[model samples]
Target chain A: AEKVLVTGGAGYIGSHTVLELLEAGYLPVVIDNFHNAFRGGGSLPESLRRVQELTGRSVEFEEMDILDQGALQRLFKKYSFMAVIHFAGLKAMGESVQKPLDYYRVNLTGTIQLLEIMKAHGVKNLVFSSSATVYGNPQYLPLDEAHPTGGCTNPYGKSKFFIEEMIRDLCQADKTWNVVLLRYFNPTGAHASGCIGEDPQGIPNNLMPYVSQVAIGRREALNVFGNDYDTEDGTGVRDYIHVVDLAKGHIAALRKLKEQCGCRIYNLGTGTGYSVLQMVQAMEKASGKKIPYKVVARREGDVAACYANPSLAQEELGWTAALGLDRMCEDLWRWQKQNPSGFGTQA
Target chain B: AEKVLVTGGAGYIGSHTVLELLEAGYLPVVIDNFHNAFRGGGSLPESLRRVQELTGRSVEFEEMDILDQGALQRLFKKYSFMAVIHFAGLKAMGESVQKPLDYYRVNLTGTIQLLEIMKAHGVKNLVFSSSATVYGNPQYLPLDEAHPTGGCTNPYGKSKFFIEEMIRDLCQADKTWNVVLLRYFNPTGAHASGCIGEDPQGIPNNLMPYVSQVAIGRREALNVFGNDYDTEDGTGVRDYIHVVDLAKGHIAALRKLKEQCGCRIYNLGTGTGYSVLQMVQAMEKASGKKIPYKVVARREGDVAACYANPSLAQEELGWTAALGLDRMCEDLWRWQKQNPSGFGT
Candidate 1:
């Protein structure tokens, strides 16, 4: 089977993308360090195991850190990867302020290692997972790919911006390489089957996941950041794309790469945004519970309103968000209710 | 004697600065991987050997790479270095465009590895060898330290810019760190004794060494890149400072760093620009050789004229470029005539 090697394939979006790749008839070999992702001394992580059970097809897995050069060199020879969907690296924003070295090491340095190995093995096609945070403060609403990056507040976003530039330069230097920078908007929701969802360790950094945990009675209550914004609800608004839709964008991006185009960037979002209060209201109706919440002081880095103009991905990659707020809420509720303790309450 | 750990101390500018460290009554310990540098299995290179003979004092030398974190840990434990003078990096601009990963891996990653060890070992004070390339195409005349950085055209310069930002952030994160970034202009000539000098591999990159080789008849006529620039001879002009003056600037920089200033930068140049024709004429007078040259097309990135402000370095570090053009030419010719093969023959 033609395989696309997926880095960080055991994590939330990574695992979801692996399922999408499998559903689209491409075998995926996962190489996750299992740092942020879950693994209990098994080759197939429970999330990945669920991926196999859902797809009724087997996938290859390698428990290797991207920093381990010897292991990566060995792993490259074993499977002929058609392309790489790189989803690895640390992703916490607040934590990155405390430890910039860890973010730099895992994100920028690890990308260098991955790029060198990918070039060596003649596997050039890459789909990188970038973030909306690379835009820093929203200069204008509905951020497009043409907007300038860099000048990030934290090292996490700085590292992302740096890697994007590095990848941009890498493609510019080598004509043979093809890359796609999928600047993902806020990714939420989960697999519709309820088999797998965002199982963030400790408290969630995002709203939907934290809201889901509150709905399930795991966390105490949701902390609505601020209500003094100029928006309709006075709460912050963001473009929250379903993780499955974000995963499907990778497949379209990979097909575009096969066409041998130059380096391209796309915003994978629905364009339409929902405010914080709207999300809370939707989750309350879906979970059949009044979600306890309190309006607190705004987080330092939080902005009033920010979304993506994902028209480029829709036009070029031939992809758009198919699921809406209702499915995003229902699916997330299914995953959280099934496994209250996440992967620990394994079946 | 107080010791300074010099990374890549066997290399050209590094070797010169280690000598300055010794003459100033400070013990210099060098740890060079010797990949880009020449050592030939000796603890001290031919350059460092001459430094010991000239100064009448011995300096410690080690052959280790910054990438080897374990070895850096052990090396730091072995020496109670009062400060570090980091000059180690792969510095080919065009080559970096082709192999950015190699540049990032060694330059950025190795610097990170070196910094973590420095923080662990308590050797917090550092003098980093930055370049004028970080300024990109000069937004204004006579580049100053206040010039906005991070618009570099290549990864080599970009890596230096990145490291400077990293060091700045590291200092901001912790107050104990004291760093000095010395952005150098064109470094030319040799030590006054002519025992040690810039020994670049293959064809030299800078104007001085190429002219020195041409004067010594080791190479063909020098190719003067442009003859249509906005200068006296219509050729590109540069601020060429003697290497010894640059080394002494490092010493003054170290003294200022000991004052516990958080992080600072200084341009180490003569605050003067000399045309290509002027440098050739001076070298001819110093070497008594009619150095042949050809006026060619301008290289793409070359500017018409580029000099340094250098006032900040003078005012803050209490240092100035003392060696004039005649002295620069005299010492370069001496080094050129003595070692035609450049530490190899």
Candidate 2:
């Protein structure tokens, strides 16, 4: 079987994508440092073990840092990989402001080091886990892959932009380098199985995780930043693609890279944008619980509305976001109920 | 005596700046990798030996790479530095287009790594070797400090711009950093002493080294990139500061870093711009040689004229370019003539 190297493969999107890769008949080998990734001191996290249960296959999970060069070299020496799905990074906007050095070091230097190793081993196929945050502010409606980057106000966003540029430059320099920069728009929800889902460290930095924690009685209420926008419900509206849909987007991108050897970018998003109020109402319906919320002042960098054209992904990769808000809400609710304390508790 | 850590203090500008730093009663300890820097299998580069000779002071030179974190930790552990004059970086614009990873890795990541070590050790004072390349084109004739950056299109320019941004962000995050970004315009000529000068490896990148090569019969005629420009002589005019003057600018930056704890930027240049034909003529008069040249098509992204206002450095740092075209040509010709082959027996 063909093997894929998934970094941060014990984390939310990384673990979810690993499961999808297994289901698609590709073996996903993980090198998880378990910083944001969860592991209750075992061989594999309960998430990956559950994935094994579902897919009926074992995984190669190596506990290693992305910044560790020699270990990475040794890992590459052991097994060959078809592609590298880079999901390991420091991904906090506010934290990045205070500690820019850590962000640039672990995120930017880590990627540089990874690329150096990959170049040495002649494994240039990469599907980078890029974010819509690269688009600093939407200059237009329906953000496409053609949108320019590098207006990022924060260090974390700049690091992503810098990584994207380095990858682009690497591809340009070497002809055989196959890259797929999958720009993900707001990813939420959990896997439909209710076994594994978003397990963020510290306070969750996203809408779905916060909303799910509220549904599970972890948090008191969701502070909806800015309830007076130009949207249908005067709050901020974002293109929240389901986690499963985004994971599948990675698979589609991998297939695209397999076909050709050049750099291509695709926006992994549901073509619809949903407001905070709409998400609140939807989760309330699925959870059968009153998800409490309060309107507050806007986040400094939040946009009024941001969605994806997503036609590029549909046309090129022959993939579209399948799950809608209700499915997203139900799966998220199921995961919250199944593992209220996340993978730390026994399943 | 104040001990300053001069990274890449073995290269052209680095060597000359070390001379000035030594002359100014400061001990400059060098950590040179000797990649682009010249060394003839010894403890120090010939230029540093010359600087020591000129200053009558013995110096400490450690052969180390800036990217080597362990080595940096050890070096910082051993010696307490008053400030660091960082001149270590890959600095070829044309080659940067072909090899961007090298540029970013060496220029950008290397600086980040250096800053990390400095942060760990609580040594925040630094004098960076910045370039005029940060300002891509002449938005105006006399480019001042207030000119906007980030118009850079190549990897080399972008690396410098990126490093500058990183420094800015780093300073914003912490309050203790005292950084002086000395954006140098065309640094030409050599030290008046015929011993230490710009000895570039391989075919030269800049015009002065190439012109010096042509004068010294080391290479053929120079290929002047653009002759059709809106200048005095229809050739691209640049503000060529003497190498010695450029070195003094680093000294001034180091002094500025001493008195303040904030980020500052200045242009190190002779305010007067010189056309290509004029520079060639000046060198010819000094060297007594026909510096042959061929006018060719404009190199991509070559502006018509680029110089610096340079008043900011003069007012803020109490420094100015004292040498003129005659002195620059005289010094360069003397060095090129004295050592037909640079730094070797």
Candidate 3:
């Protein structure tokens, strides 16, 4: 099995992607600083331990940061990596404005340092976890990869844009580099075994985790902002892809890199839109509990409706979202019910 | 006298600006890595050595690079800097395309490191040497500060745009930052004295240095790119500001910072356009020699006419370019004739 280096592999999407990499017959070596990941009562996080149980594959794990160039060079010398999947970054949107330098230093400089090391080690194939927020507010319906990507409102989104541009320039400068920028929409839910899922620290920043917390009796109620938008439920709508489906997109991206694709961008999203009420009702059906919610005024910088034209990934990478909203809600509830405090209190 | 830190103070614009800073009664402490400067037979570069000679004030100098955070921090502790005039960067436009990462590392990360140190030391005032190249390809006739500034073709201009945006964000985040981004337009000429001028490493990159080299017989002839443009002389035109006048703008920027103006931008140009043929003829008259040239094909990314409105800097910082085209050519020829080779020989 070829070895793959996964940065930030203990985090939500990274553990799920590592599980997929294991199932695909690739030996994944995960390096995480645990800046945002929760450390359970063991050598490894419960997420990766559960991933090992589900896939029956021992993950090569190390507590490391990408910014530490010396440690990264040592790891490269230890294991011969075929490629790198970069997921390490600071992602709190609200906290980004308060500490923009932290975002730039960790995200921008961290990526630059990682690229420099990877170039030194001759590991040029990469799959970066970009965000749908790169498209600030949708200029047109069904945001595609062709939309312009610069004028971001906060430092988090700006860091992603800068990294994408830097990677593009890197590809143009050297032809051996194969990069895939996966602009992901909302990634919700978990593996079907209810072993590992989204484990965000403190208050959740996304809709799915917040909804799951409310379902699990941890949070009070979900604040449905602005039930008067130009949508089916008069609330803001987003394309929420399942975590499994999103992880499978990484498998497809790795395959695309094998074909020597110079540099490509794919929107990893389901061509579907779900509203706040629609998600609440789905979670209620899955968990058999009432998710209390209140209508409130809209948040700033929130758009009416935003989904992805995910045909580019389908046509090129041969990848598509396999699970629907019910499976998403069911799997999310399973993880939430199993671990109420998110990997800290194991059932 | 106030103490000001001048990064890259041995280069052309920096050397001239340090001379003016001395004349204006400010103690300019210069730190140069000499990556792009020529070291004469002395402790300082010939440019700063002659700056001391012209202004009768010693330029407090050290050999330092801004990327070394510990060195910069120690220097901050050594002297109280009222402001910083940053002129340190990789400026060759053609070389920037070939080595984008070097430009980003030196230019972008260098600025980030400097800003971090300044914030740490509470030296909140800064005057940056931005370029009109940040305004890529001139969307309008006379470019102003309000022109849309991003889509740069090369890494050098993009780095400038990125730094400008980053500084704007820094000001928005911190209220104590007083930054004045001076967007310069084609700074030419040298001091009235014939001692200190541009000393490019290899062949000249800009028009003034190349034309001066042609007159000094270092280079054979100049390639006049396209005489079919829509200008006064049917050639590409640019806003040429004398380097001395451009240096004085930094003093005005320091004044603006004292007024606590937060993150302002001003274009330092003469509001006058000169064609390539016009510059060539002026050099011919100044040097008393014929500049042989051929009208070749127009270069890629070359624009027809690009000058500056330059009124905002005049209105706000009270700065206006004082030297004319003849004076610019005369001073340039004087520097070239006095030293046939640049500062090196």
Candidate 4:
């Protein structure tokens, strides 16, 4: 089996990707520091345990911080990873602005340390988890891969932008590097098996997870940020792709790296926008329950409407979001029903 | 004596500043990793010993890396520092372009670590040694502190630019920060005492040290990069300030910081541009020796001319370069005569 190192592999999308890799006959070695992940003693996280049961495959796990160069080098020596799927970073917007230094140190400095180790170990292939946040307040709708980036308002987004620039500079300096930056557009929902899903820590800052929590009665209610925007339904419209499809996009990115020699970026989205009310209505129908929500003023740094024109990924990498809005809602509802309290209860 | 922490306090301008601090009745605490600094066993670096001999004062010394957080915190605890004068950085322009990561890590990352430790210990005032290289290739002559930065070509210059931006951001985030960014133009010459002076390790990348070595017969010849630029003699021109004056400017900066709360930046120069050949002629006159040199093709990233408008530093800080070109060359030659090997022997 092809060995691939997945950083932050115990978390939401990471756990789902592990399942997908197992199903696709790939050996995954996970390295998670558990800062934002769930790691119970003597067992994998609840999501990964379910993935093991679902696939009958064991993922090799190591608890290590990316900033620790010695541990990363040891892991690299142990496993000759074909590529690295990097997903370790702090991802809170409000917290990022307040503690910019911490964010920059952990996100940017940690990534530099990782890259240094990767260079030392001669592991140049990387699949970075970039975000649509890099494209701050989009100039045009249905944001394509060609859209200009790096005007991020928060440090979290700036960290992503800085990493992308660093990777590009690295690739330019040395042609041996093969990088695939996957700019995910609001990944939501869970696997079809309801085995692994996004278990966001604290009150969910994302739309779907909050909606799912409200439907599952974990949270009191959701506040739809703004209803005054010029959209189909005035609530902020986002391109919410299913988490499973987003996972598959990573596999596709890895495959593309095998054939490519330089850095390439792809937008992983359904190319369809859904407003907050529409997502709430879909969740209410899928779960057969009401998700109490209140429409408040627009949150700072939120764009009115942002989706992806994912044709580049489809044409270039032969990958696109295969699931629709209804399927996304259904899978999310299944995960919500199965794991009502997220990974905390199982741990 | 008011205590001051000097990172890179054993280097060229740093050693000169240490002497000036001693003269001003301020206690200078030296902290250097000795990466680019020279420290002899059983004593401080030859430069610091000469500084003590010249001023008849002792400096508290700590052989510690700024990046080592534990060591930095310990130093802070030991000495109740009034302010930090930061000059620690990698200064190779060509190497920085080739190895940007090392430059960023050592210069940028190390600076952030230092600032974080300083903040933890409640040391809010800093006088950073920035460069006019942060201004990149000068669009106009007499570059002032208000000129826009961050167009630097190499990582060495970029590191300086990034540190300035970080300092600006830090000062903006809090009101207690008193930062004085000294964007120095070309600093040349030695102290008037000629006891302690510029001693660069390996091949000197700057002009004065290389020229001094050539005058002292250590190096065969000086390679003047680009003598075909738009200048008085069609060579590259820079604002060459005497090293002792630059040291006094730091004292002025600290004095201003003691009276202010916001960050202030000033250009430390003589407000005069000197071409390469003009500098050579000046050095030759002072040393009373013929310094053979050759004109090479224009070095990549070489700008035509870059001087400073020293009015702000002069008016506000009450500081300006008092030494003339002849005095700069004479003091440099005197230092070279005293220590021909430059801490190597």
Top candidate on lDDT is 3
DockQ of each: 0.49, 0.60, 0.42, 0.26
Residue lDDT tens for model 1, A1-347: 55799999999999999999999999898999889877844568889988988999997898899988889888788888889999999998368776767777788778888988988888899999999988888888779987878755777887888788778777777888899999999898889899898988888878998898899988788999999998899999999889999999999999999899779888999998999999999999999988999999988777888899988988999999998989898888999898787885243
TM-score of each: 0.94, 0.95, 0.95, 0.87
TM-score of 4: 0.87
TM-score of chain B of each: 0.96, 0.97, 0.98, 0.97
**Stretch of 10 with least lDDT, candidate 2 chain B:** B36-45
Which candidate model has the greater lDDT, 3 or 4?
A: 3
lDDT per prediction? Answer: 0.87, 0.86, 0.88, 0.84
Which residue pairs show collisions in model 1? none
Instruction: Tell me the docking grade of candidate 4.
Output: acceptable
How are the candidates ranked when ordered by lDDT, highest leading?
3, 1, 2, 4
Candidate 2 lDDT over B65-137, as tens digits, reads: 9888889999999888888999999888368777767887888789999999988988899889888888888
Worst 10 residues of 2 chain A by lDDT: A34-43
lDDT of 4 by residue, A1-347 (tens): 55899998888889889888899888989888888777664557666777888999997888888878779989988878889999888887367766656666777778877887887888889999999998888989889988888654776786787677667767766788899999999888888877568888788787888899899988888898989998878988999999899999988888988996589998999999989999999999999998898888898878889999999999988998999999999999998898887765344
Tell me the deviation in Å of residue B117 in model 1.
2.1
Error (Å) of candidate 4 at residue B190 is 2.3
Q: What is the interface RMSD of candidate 3, in Å?
A: 1.7
**Which residue runs of candidate 4 sit more than 4 Å off their true CA positions?**
A135-152, A218-221, A226-239, A259-298, A303-318, A345-347, B137-147, B168-176, B227-234, B259-271, B291-293, B309-327
What is the C-alpha lDDT profile of model 3 across A190-215, one tens digit per residue?
99988788888778767888998999
